[PDB]
Amino acid sequence: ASVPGTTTDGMDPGVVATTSVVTAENSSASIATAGIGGPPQQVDQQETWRTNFYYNDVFTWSVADAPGSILYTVQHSPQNNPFTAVLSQMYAGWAGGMQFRFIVAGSGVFGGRLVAAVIPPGIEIGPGLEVRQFPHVVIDARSLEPVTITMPDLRPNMYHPTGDPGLVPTLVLSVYNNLINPFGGSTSAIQVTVETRPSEDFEFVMIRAPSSKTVDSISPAGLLTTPVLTGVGNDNRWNGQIVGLQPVPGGFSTCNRHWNLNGSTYGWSSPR
Amino acid sequence: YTPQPDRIVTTPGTPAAAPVGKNTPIMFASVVRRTGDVNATAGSANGTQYGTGSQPLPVTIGLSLNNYSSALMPGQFFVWQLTFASGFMEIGLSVDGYFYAGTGASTTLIDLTELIDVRPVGPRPSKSTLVFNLG
Amino acid sequence: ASVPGTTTDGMDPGVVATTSVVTAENSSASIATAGIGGPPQQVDQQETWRTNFYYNDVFTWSVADAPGSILYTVQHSPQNNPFTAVLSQMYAGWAGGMQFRFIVAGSGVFGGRLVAAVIPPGIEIGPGLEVRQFPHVVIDARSLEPVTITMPDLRPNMYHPTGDPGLVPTLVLSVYNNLINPFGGSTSAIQVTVETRPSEDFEFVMIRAPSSKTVDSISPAGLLTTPVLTGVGNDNRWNGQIVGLQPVPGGFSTCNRHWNLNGSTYGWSSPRFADIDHRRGSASYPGNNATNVLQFWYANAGSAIDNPISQVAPDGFPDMSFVPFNGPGIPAAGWVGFGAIWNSNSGAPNVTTVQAYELGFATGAPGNLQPTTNTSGSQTVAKSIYAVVTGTAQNPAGLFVMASGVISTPSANAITYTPQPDRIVTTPGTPAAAPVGKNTPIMFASVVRRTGDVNATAGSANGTQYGTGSQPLPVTIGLSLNNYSSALMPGQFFVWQLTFASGFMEIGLSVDGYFYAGTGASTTLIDLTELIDVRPVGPRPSKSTLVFNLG
Amino acid sequence: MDPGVVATTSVVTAENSSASIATAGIGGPPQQVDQQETWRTNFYYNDVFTWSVADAPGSILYTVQHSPQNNPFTAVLSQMYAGWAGGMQFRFIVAGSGVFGGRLVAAVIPPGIEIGPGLEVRQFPHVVIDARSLEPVTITMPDLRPNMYHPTGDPGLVPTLVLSVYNNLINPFGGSTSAIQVTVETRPSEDFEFVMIRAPSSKTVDSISPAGLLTTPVLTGVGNDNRWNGQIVGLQPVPGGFSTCNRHWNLNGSTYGWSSPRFADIDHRRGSASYPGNNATNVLQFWYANAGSAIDNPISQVAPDGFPDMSFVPFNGPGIPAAGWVGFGAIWNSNSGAPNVTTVQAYELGFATGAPGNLQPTTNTSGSQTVAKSIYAVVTGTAQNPAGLFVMASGVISTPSANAITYTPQPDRIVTTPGTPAAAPVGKNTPIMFASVVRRTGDVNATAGSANGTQYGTGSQPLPVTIGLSLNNYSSALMPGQFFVWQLTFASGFMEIGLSVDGYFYAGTGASTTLIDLTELIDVRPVGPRPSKSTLVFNLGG
Amino acid sequence: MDPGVVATTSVVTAENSSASIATAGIGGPPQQVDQQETWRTNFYYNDVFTWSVADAPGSILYTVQHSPQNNPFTAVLSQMYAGWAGGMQFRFIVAGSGVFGGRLVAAVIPPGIEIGPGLEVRQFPHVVIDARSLEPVTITMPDLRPNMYHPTGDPGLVPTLVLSVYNNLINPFGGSTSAIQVTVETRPSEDFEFVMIRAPSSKTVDSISPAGLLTTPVLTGVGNDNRWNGQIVGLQPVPGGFSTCNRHWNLNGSTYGWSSPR
Amino acid sequence: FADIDHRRGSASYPGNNATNVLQFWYANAGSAIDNPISQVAPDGFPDMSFVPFNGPGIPAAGWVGFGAIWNSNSGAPNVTTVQAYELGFATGAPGNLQPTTNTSGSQTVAKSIYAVVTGTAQNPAGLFVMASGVISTPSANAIT
């Protein structure tokens, strides 16, 4: 009695594609050296946030992208999942893997393949990075079942602290083979959606008070929120409603009332 | 817009916002009234006047209280997703504090009146094209 | 034995996809809870109204819909199934889940996925809602077998009263991935049909009289039928038959006889074409001779003490900005009317001055008369367009103007529809119609006589003048009494289906009282001559584009 | 004991229940058969009929056929089922009194029998219902059919239930109370079932029997007349009768007259114009045409659309005429008409004979001529032979001084076309006429307060009723000889209002000419058809 | 038979009694549930309403909500209990006469329905009450609620009991007597229970509906006017009307005039 | 904290000479059709009662902001009538100036506190005043 591949459950991983970085000794070492933070917390395997896949990002794959061109890049972090980012406000450290589910919304008439490799930490990410010379999994554009890969937690640290996570692996989806629409025309692009889920060895180690360093001090996610860019936030020059974005093709250099990510300024004005 | 990059007073020592690939620096526009026309607001028949700033005021307020040194290594963007009524587009934040969106050599002002959802996606490399399509 | 999958029975679900909320002990905690209404009514899992899937709503899925764009969202209600909606007027409360079966009309050459999530009842649904971060399933556009998604009854209440259900879960089926049609050409959309069958735990509890009134604002499907368009039914500014709809690109704002979903008006002028009467206001005339002059009446905006709705204008005074004119040349458009002057203190109207007067709102009377845009800080004005041999100059004076109006045109050939969107006055604090997506606001035209030509007939001898109004008067009459605050969820519109002789056009009605159509950037008047019948569809969100299949 | 408890109860079956269920399997399984449902174990209201003392023993009061519209919940279930079979239980509740006496017959007539005066119900298998009975009498209607099931929309031959007088109603008092009300309550029997589910879009009964068209606000809110667009504040009876045919629509899809139901405009193109006096300064313009020259009106040729159907009053000189119909308007020349600037005035229109000499009022439209004379002075007067009028549709009443003349029109001034049905008082019932407060020329500020009684203008029937009747055909929706009756409930009383096959409205006031105010009126309610011999109730607040 | 004997009796339950008691355990054990108590096995006076001949058939005479203030002993028990659940039994006693006639409708309106002129009670599951009836007609009000229990002070959605005219009252005499009195008697049902005991200092109804302010001695003893401080000996009617605004206080906390009450 | 902007507010100057005159601007409340929330007053208007003051006398505990008057036919502000204008509510503008609290029947009344050469007497004129305000004090000593 069957389920049509066309439709997938949220708990359904699809086809589990393995990679040479994903091993048993890596997982056993991950748990054995994550135990220094204490017992594993939020480890109950029947929770809704641990079994279901939740949306991370979507991206466009077109026929104008050469092979080796990187389309999608995710750093290993608990901010990828929307539920481990909420559980990280009350825990002082995290350790373990994460699973990424890819759904390629192509038909049988398309051609070309994606590639998927887990970059070890310490490697620069950008153009000239040859994904296809890593341990990799190819993904066809005519794939119907979703394909999933596990990101192993390849760390030099024992655990990752919440404020400073340290060095983390990176997952890249680049063009393995050029997408080819045999037809010819303006309708030459497809979309691939990434859903993320914590693995079986993902855990948080020690608890901490949420009145500690808050979400405005560990990541700048709350600096740009929804009402700020619509009718609340003002510029740092004129005190007016931000109603547009003006691109500068030649570049500029603003010194006064401009703060970097190091909490410093080169100007002469307080932030008001 | 008045704050043209050819006339901005800058102390010696600040980093420069340079275009990285197809990504280009952006500056946050706002309607600023003039001494040529008091009643000139957005959509005026006399012509709207735009005042542009480098960062939003809540962003530079929150940047002056906290430190994100262990959040973005040099050469990485922090990217938010801005979805509109028609399309969606992405802006990114550098280490120096400048905002980067990928439009290439285009200088058209973004309308920004149909913005509905602003959400973050996390750290991304600097030499990657942020997706921009208003339709 | 063997079905191929191309043919599915009405009792056939196909593939069943439960996301994370269809649990057995949830159904057990819902069945034992709903006994507070007594024995469960209409529970028998052999009846043909609850074992077969039935049509609820069909909707299109174009290639222009971005991921996350809302295609089809319904709340948990008996109205999602036709026989359950029939028994909903028979019963007085319900509890239990419902099965939603989706059929995708797509070939194997299409591509793209459709997400489907069950929203918990406490979540406000609007622009900032992200659907794909909920427990969901995806449905491909190449789905041959139908997919059923059972929406359970998650509720903080015991049972759901039909009058006040409180908090109900919501099924949202939005775009997961862009539908691709790798072929170019005219084919850029497919269709998805939603079938609905009540679940194994659906039940009704109490009886009530057939269709007894209820706290739940009734669905506004009865205030707009077919005759309204091709028969009786008049306008808001004038009393004429609606001969067509015209789309205005940019928007407009009318706040005279306009009532919102929540029964309220922002302005004067109760919905009835009676007459215009005032008592306080001054009359004056130019010229040293009191013979063959033009009378000049004005009062300030706020002396309408007898008006029980708002003080800013007398009842029936039109919302037309004044066109300033001087001399024997008659003005271009405006609101004239056959009327007279009258004095106060038990005074009857004067015999020798009955004439056509044009009315309006001015600023700076009686000097440099200027047109007025805002109602606040203004003054109402009225002056004759023809010659009358007498003038009165008493400080207490008033008008008597018939309520039906016409448009004064100097040469009167083709002209322009009146009033324009730049000529309608507005009270402060008005809501403004804006074009959302490809949907533009529309405005209903009618045939109105002119002072230059008495024969303003729709035939030969010059094109006609189309007088335009905001919403029809039977809609305002039926909506000035009832309250529809909970009938339609804000951010969507109640869409109907007009059926012409060679096509169809969908018309939506928002929460502001305005009407929307997906004509696009066109100013072409659409003629209602071949319109046959009107069938209601129901709630549909603003991201969906209405069809414009015209012959 | 019929409470809201768990309850044992007893759902009484029918005599042919074993063969009703078995042969109704041709539609498949029986649907909505479950004996614990609370729509099947309770009696619900079906109809009320009036049993008066003036009825013969054996005269039929209440007749109804076997149908699922006899129950409020089987009729609700009937839109989603294309076929039904099974019996029904009827309960009769009498209002009655201890001092009243007389019996009734309830019996089930088998199919193939005519129902009328010749039918003798007392020899059928029946039950007897007293007037003074406390416990309501229950009868069961078996489903005696020549078919296997009754499809909705064409049910075939059905049994009939007939209520006849066994002994005539006696009141030992005398007058005052001379009628009683009996309530029929209807419950499905044991063998009642539905078969063969259908889409609810399919509908059979589309004639409410003129019902949903007259709701309550129509009278305590919106609602206008047929003469002016005035708000309805009163009903006033007239004894003797009246005739109206302008915007008066009968129960079929027809009318006898002009003037489509809309207050837009009056426009006529061809007709002669004149003015008296040798001086063409400060005169009264007089326009005339004959009856039958209206080519542009597609309904009737006798008048332009919107012309008032009143008789012209003969007046001359500077005196303002009493009563009448005036409206603001102007005269326009032909040949791509642009009107003359120097003539816009109030004009009194109407019907005369012998224009422009000795003007006499007219009663019949045949042999008459339409006239239009100004009441106020105008500085120019034309006399061109092709000329027309353009008069607004809403009108006011011209008056010499203030005070209050009478309600206008009187029943004798109203013009009729040949072939018009006349209102006649039948029994103690008498026709009514809907009143509205209208503005006048002697006093513009005719607010309903002090400074004499305000002027009342009366039309025939409400406009909502004219609009909702024009489209639909009701040739069988009301059985001739009866009227459809609504039940108005005030704050301190109630009244029954009827509606015949001719569009007229009736109330049982008798010989009284007093206006009845809908100030304290709250709600109306449909009842159904009821015969003309029954007097409508007049338990008002007085 | 309702005497002061040992008695067998019959305390008639409700249709949803199995689910009313079980879900009311969220407040703990059920309190004041004992079927031999004499405040639960007898009918007591609740309200009287006048049914006149000048009322339309279907006009609402008596409307009341499901509440423990409908019984004189559950309202007494209500000050020491912060929550109740369960049904109630209503009995209607008509004064009537043999010469009077006409029926009434008693039915339980489910929650979520407006109560007024548009409501049609005759198509509800109901009981019929004659004017000339000897034995009083009993209806049971089930506790149909969207909550588990009704806390006192904010009971939520409750069913409503509506008395409407089935057939209008007729008097074949003429004038004189043109109204009748109907007495409503109220008894708790089988599943009625209290939960979650509270201090009696807590109070909900503090407006007597202007009641305890006018007692009897106010008129046959102490009591003064608003103009002079004179003892009240009479009431005198006036036809046509009058206006007083000096020490005349309306039902809100306001007046239109001077002269504080002293 | 945005600027105060109002169209068609009456402006005048007392006397006949236009040397060291004090600029007077007033507009009735309920006529400022500029906000989507209410028409009682323009945006950024302080909720302060006007303390009356004449001649060369600095007012006290008052909301003074830097402002100018523009012609409504063009929108261009006038050159010389840029001063620190007291912003508040008053009851009677052409006669004696008195403070007020209620908005019904009061009027938005603005007046400069230092001497301005000449001044616009145009009746449909408009008033612009910047967002933030400083304190009008007769002396250098602080108050409550």
Side-chain angles (χ1 to χ4, degrees), chain C residues 76 150 334 374 392 548:
Chain C
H76 204 31
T150 306
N374 194 223
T392 87
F548 204 43

Side-chain angles (χ1 to χ4, degrees), chain A residues 2-11 48 51-55 58 82-83 101 103-110 142-146 181 183 186-187 189-195, chain C residues 14-20 65-67 108-113 128 130 132-147 149 176-184:
Chain A
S2 345
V3 183
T6 39
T7 170
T8 84
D9 191 39
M11 302 181 21
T48 311
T51 57
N52 284 72
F53 281 92
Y54 302 105
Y55 161 75
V58 79
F83 294 107
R101 182 166 81 165
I103 298 184
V104 186
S107 54
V109 310
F110 270 102
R142 333 152 50 163
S143 97
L144 161 87
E145 259 314 285
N181 177 59
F183 294 18
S186 64
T187 172
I190 67 170
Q191 268 170 3
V192 187
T193 320
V194 189
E195 301 146 90
Chain C
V15 52
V16 194
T18 75
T19 86
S20 182
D65 300 62
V109 311
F110 275 98
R113 317 250 171 169
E130 164 81 278
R132 289 152 301 178
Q133 279 172 26
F134 282 87
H136 59 271
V137 300
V138 305
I139 310 165
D140 204 335
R142 297 170 278 162
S143 287
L144 181 91
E145 286 271 64
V147 190
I149 324 284
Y176 184 78
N177 274 168
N178 228 60
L179 172 81
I180 54 183
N181 174 58
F183 292 92

Side-chain angles (χ1 to χ4, degrees), chain C residues 363 373-377 427-429, chain F residues 8 30-36 38-39:
Chain C
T363 312
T373 319
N374 194 223
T375 317
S376 175
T427 40
Chain F
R8 57 206 64 246
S31 65
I33 40 151
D34 288 312
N35 317 63
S38 48
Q39 308 346 299

